[PDB]
């Protein structure tokens, strides 16, 4: 299969990797594995090391920085052995385990957390390759979101819901609205919005990814039942600076920052999405329910 490689500025050190996406499986994390090419004569410091930087850039305050002694030797992996076999007698492997309770590769739409593998002999003696620590969507759907509100001398009994909780990026969430206005105030307008909050563990905001302001007026003392559809994606969120975008490798275009799954005081950023049904009345009622937007698991 594919094998990524990158040479050092002086052309001697060649860092070899298999993948640049490490799926942060809820319980554990996929280790960073690679092998670095080295010519002993060129090596002047006599000590070549490999490091894993989990950096929060904006400022730069790391959270897990580790070092592995590439040479001289202080096990090996299935891909590393083949990489060495291809390279020969001048390459040395390195492995990193990423402990739990560590952030997930996530960036703010122009920031955020990042994962990098840097091999150096200890400027010209440093070679850096980006990676991603990211999380798939949960395997099985969660409970159906539901939220009912009452406003009162008569109620404005409202209810909103979504079919399920696990929704992939660029997929339409169905918002079921059920109103019963026994009050004498006509329902001027209905709003169904979806907002993304990106706490920075402390700062946070509320970016509306989706908006749908319908004029489905329900006259006083009358019921109503409808199924709206709102699709959150990046088609229209280009101007919104600060939106939590998912993990990148480069300036490539990515999707909405997958909802930060958790098993609270985890540094980096914690991102979540909520669907809000707000009735504007002739003095406006609100109800909400959260959902977790992520990417699927290829298979």
């Amino acid at each position: 299969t594919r094998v990524f490689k990158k040479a050092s500025p002086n052309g001697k050190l060649t860092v070899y990797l298999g993948k640049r996406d490490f799926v942060d499986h809820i319980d554990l994390v996929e280790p960073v594995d690679g092998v670095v090419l080295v010519d002993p004569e060129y090596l002047k410091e006599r000590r070549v090391y490999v490091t894993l930087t989990c950096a929060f850039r904006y400022f730069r305050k790391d959270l897990f920085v580790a070092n592995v002694q590439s040479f001289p030797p202080a096990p090996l992996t299935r891909l590393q052995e083949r990489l060495i076999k291809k390279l020969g007698e001048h390459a040395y492997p390195f492995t990193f385990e990423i402990p739990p309770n560590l952030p997930c590769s996530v960036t703010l739409q122009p920031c955020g957390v990042d994962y990098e593998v840097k091999a150096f002999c200890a400027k010209r003696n440093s070679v850096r390759l980006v990676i991603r620590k990211v999380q798939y969507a949960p395997e099985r759907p969660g409970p159906q979101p539901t939220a009912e509100t009452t406003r009162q001398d008569k109620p404005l009994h409202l209810e909103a819901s979504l079919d399920k909780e696990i929704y992939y990026h660029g997929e339409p969430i169905s918002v079921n609205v059920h109103v019963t206005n026994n009050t004498n105030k006509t329902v001027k307008k209905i709003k169904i919005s979806v907002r993304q909050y990106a706490d920075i563990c402390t700062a946070q905001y509320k970016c509306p990814v989706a908006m749908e302001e319908a004029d489905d007026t329900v006259a006083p003392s009358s019921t109503f039942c409808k199924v709206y559809t709102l699709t959150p994606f990046l088609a229209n969120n280009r101007e919104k600076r600060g939106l939590a975008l998912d993990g990148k490798l480069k300036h490539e275009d990515t999707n909405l920052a997958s909802s930060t799954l958790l098993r609270r005081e985890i540094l980096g950023i914690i991102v979540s999405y909520k669907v809000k049904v707000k009735l504007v009345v002739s003095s406006d009622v609100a109800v909400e329910l959260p959902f977790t937007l992520m990417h699927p698991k290829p298979k």
Partner: peptide, 7 residues
């Protein structure tokens, strides 16, 4: 920049 090959 980041290179690429085959195994």
């Amino acid at each position: 920049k980041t290179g690429l090959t085959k195994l």
